[PDB]
């Protein structure tokens with residue numbers, strides 16, 4: 001079976017862009033150094049250690065108490081906010097991928113941890129958070145890109161993501177067989193990039209030794225689509241410590257869909273949002 | 286030749302909905318009382334008298350100087366924010382129209398004034414702010430609704446909006462003649478309601494004298510779609526003086542697209558935005 005291509009960080013962007021249209025997915029090998037990965041893991045550990053609140057939790061309250069989830073990791077994990085989120089290889093890919101739709105930003109970035117004994121996900125498309133995506137035709141400009149960060153090893157046994165190459169060209173998901181998929185086996189620091197409409201499934205975790213598989217999922221969307229997570233409650237001090245790119249990703253700046261939108265989006269008083277807010281940024285100068 | 290149906294403000298919503306799927310548009314007669322129309326007009330006169338800006342204007346700078354425009358009237362006109370934005374009939378229509386896509390909110394509401402001697406708009410659909418709308422099939426859940434408030438009289442002289450009935454079912458805009466459209470002639474306090482994909486055009490203004498024609502356009506979108514105007518810089522006192530419904534329309538609350546989105550949208554910390562912000566409201 002044709003496998004997912006593993007590319008070094010210096011790989012050609014045109015090539016990556018074409019990989020996404022032909023195969024629908026690929027892996028960037030060793031993008032994040034191990035020190036970044038381990039700093040990110042420790043920040044995430046802090047969040048998972050927090051005793052559960054007394055109040056409502058929108059997603060978590062639907063699941064049993066052993067559910068492992070960290071929402072909107074950019075507000076609590078400085079390593080993601082300052083290093084992972086603004087990786088220039090990721091954004092080179094995004095800019096080439098989103099060329100026909102225009103600007104993109106971060107819709108969500110969150111931790112999942114899959115424990116030993118968990119079954120695999122059903123095969124699906126990532127068209128549920130913004131259901132209108134389910135009706136976009138294949139040839140329309142893509143509005144969503146999935147970026148999957150393994151924070152432990154992804155192996156065959158512990159549930160490496162199952163991806164069916166070319167499946168973004170299918171009419172429906174149907175009920176595909178597992179052996180039609182290939183495995184995104186990976187080391188921490190690798191990155192898996194998945195095109196809109198590609199049929200895939202988390203592999204669960206069939207190990208029995210008690211070692212959980214840890215994944216951070218980041219969804220970059222056209223700025224036409226409302227971010228699932230809103231970063232508007234970030235303190236000004238935190239917002240201003242980020243770079244312009246980071247501020248743009250977290251919804252703090254006016255953005256531009258492609259023509260025929262010739263004005264922009266996410267603005268106020270006919271001015272750019274960062275101007276009305278007098279937003280400073282770390283790399284303004 | 287079929288005309289725009291004129292309906293009483295208290296008409297049945299099922300009939301308003303049949304019209305939007307058959308004609309694609311209709312007119313509500315006398316929805317806003319005269320005292321609402323007058324105070325709204327007074328609040329817009331204040332903004333119209335604000336001196337010309339010193340910095341860039343994202344929209345205004347794109348067009349010649351006869352472009353009279355007041356963006357995001359929700360933040361500067363209390364009558365719109367406290368009365369027109371939350372009108373219960375408008376929302377009965379919206380809830381029915383957006384049933385398949387789920388929750389909706391305000392993408393934009395703004396004032397345009399069209400002086401004498403202005404030519405009509407080219408025929409078009411309202412699919413430019415969110416270009417992905419161009420590729421949605423006709424059968425897919427609608428994600429946008431246009432609500433047009435005449436603040437002066439719309440007449441055949443001064444450029445009442447031209448609407449081509451049933452044109453939401455066309456594959457493309459094409460090159461339609463002006464005589465394929467019917468005119469949304471209205472008095473202030475009426476409301477023109479236009480379905481997504483309906484071909485239409487601003488009438489311009491064929492008059493030679495007279496004050497400009499004045500219109501407030503509100504675009505209501507699925508909460509899946511990012512609001513053109515962000516109301517996030519409204520002061521907390523202003524936000525908490527509004528009703529829950531008002532806060533939802535202006536992006537200050539977590540919202541719910543339809544299943545299979547089973548969590549919602551516009552949340553933070555796995556919590557509702559209004560709960561993180563400890564947001565009071567006029568009616569909660």
Ligand SMILES: [Co+2]
Nearest residue numbers: 462463464465
């Ligand atoms: Co003719």
Ligand SMILES: [Fe+2]
Nearest residue numbers: 124125126200
């Ligand atoms: Fe998925």
Ligand SMILES: [Fe+2]
Nearest residue numbers: 409410411485
């Ligand atoms: Fe229009």
